[PDB]
Amino acid sequence: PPLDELARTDLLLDALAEREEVDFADPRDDALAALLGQWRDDLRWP
């Protein structure tokens, strides 16, 4: 149900935010998460 969509994005963003490395089935997910993590890092990086 669509409601689980929301919960799942929220969880992904929470993991991104804590710098937790997650392993996705779909490689494109993997790619996007990687891209966001690097970006998260650079932008935090004073």
Binding site: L6, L13, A17, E18, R28, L32, L35, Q38, W39, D41
Partner: protein, 68 residues
């Protein structure tokens, strides 16, 4: 001879596509590391609203990646 764009130049590119509130929300959630609620407080909306906007942003982002 062209330089491969860094994560930020790239991501930045993809962010310009997003509405400004969605973009603001991804930044708070990921870069600051604010929670859904905290983000809601910092942005003036409710928690449900943030949960929807951040989801839409994520999808939008997935899409834009495809093209290219």
């Amino acid at each position: 001879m062209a330089i491969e764009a860094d994560s930020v130049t790239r991501m930045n590119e993809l962010l310009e596509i997003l509405p400004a509130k969605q973009r603001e929300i991804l930044i708070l959630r990921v870069v600051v590391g604010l929670s859904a609620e905290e983000t809601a407080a910092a942005v003036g909306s409710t928690t449900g609203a943030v949960r929807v906007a951040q989801h839409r942003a994520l999808q939008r982002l997935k899409d834009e990646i495809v093209a290219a």
